[PDB]
Amino acid sequence: GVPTYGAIILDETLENVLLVQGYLAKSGWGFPKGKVNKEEAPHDCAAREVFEETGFDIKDYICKDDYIELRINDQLARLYIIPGIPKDTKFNPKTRREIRNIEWFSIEKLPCHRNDMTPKSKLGLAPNKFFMAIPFIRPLRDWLSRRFG
Template sequence: MFRNLIFDWSGTLVDDLPPVLDATNQVLGVYGIPPLDREEFRLRFRLPYREFYAEVLPEVPLEELEVHFRRAFSGSAEKVTVLPFAREKLEWCRQRGVRCFVLTSMDSDAFHSQLEEFGLGSYFEATYSGVLDKREVILELVAKHGLVPAETAFVGDMTHDVETAHHAQLTAVAVLTGYTHAGALALSRPHLTVQDLDGLRRLMERPGERQRPVATVGALIEDDEGRVLMVKTHKWGHRWGIPGGKIERGESSAAALVREVREETGLEIDDPVFVMVQDCIDSTEFERPEHFLLLNYVARRTSGEVKLNDEAQEFRWLTPEEALELDLNQPTRTLIEEVLGGSES
């Protein structure tokens, strides 16, 4: 699928978010700024990191901040670790002759120290570190090493990585193991999004699979008062929608609906009534380009209290009319309008 892979480092191959967050909060503390928690940091941090600091500490020179950060990072008690599947993915590439590179904004001394500590250096043909704006280097990297853009992907965890790939006309692969939430990554329009590097390995082993439409089920769930359940999820750019998911092989759509609702909300349902099927092809609202066939139902809650899994962050019980006032993903809006139109007739 790809003959060349250019990897970001932090959040893509190694998990350095704990010490980076710790060091960032130490820097903020020097100037009397309250610390950020992990999720707030992930929502606000971005590359080039000078833009992040221009927002939180606009009056302080970047050179001064870098001195504080390097000192805090080197002294942090938090540890950097290799992300799951990273070493396996690099070994997989070596066995198949896939050329690998690193392009990272990390301080060069810290990067080379980690590269040696984790024993990953032999996997890369060349590495580029200390690059504040990767768009300024990516074209040079591609030209210097004779990489064909159509055969090359840039793999990273932040919107700047996706933008860098687009800048060089490479395939942008977003990985959800690092600094940026899936919803924000989706807005930068990566060509592919994978949960982790094992997902990229499986995708490269079976490149044709992602071209097939994916059949899914979802339900507008009603309670005894006629309200419907809305859930907010990062997969749809932090918009509101309905519970649902993919139909597994050998599973009926009705069984899939019961299972997905139970897994995502803890609710039991019955009386599912089919409403409509929707094509959802490369929606800009979803976290990655994908072709879904959405089988939409209405169903009634029979038991249970809502307990969300990690796919959703918030829920509300609302009348359908109230639900239409939310920032809904378009398929959910279409479904509710169809249900309301049918009830009026």
């Protein structure tokens, strides 16, 4: 699995996080991130992917130790945590061919799991447009509690 890098951008209240909506298999909402290039350092890949997807440069804000990393299906995803970005920042992807929309979401309102279908006695999970973000939500809330209060 080629590792991916990106960011969790939060506003100044720490309430809201910046998600991006793709197309097709990436049609839902997720954190801005993408695959590392040959010989590219993690921090540079995170900044490149975030600038390509949001038009916002995190380079001067990345902290080396402040990230959440998950291994999903034997692919590693690491999102640098970037707090205090004002909600009135103008975000604009580099190309609309990959990114449909960019929005702030309330962290407390986001799901941290998908819903089963126990009502229908059917196995599996109900669709959720936050599926790409979900795995990071509980680890984020725990990280924020520890590092802030």
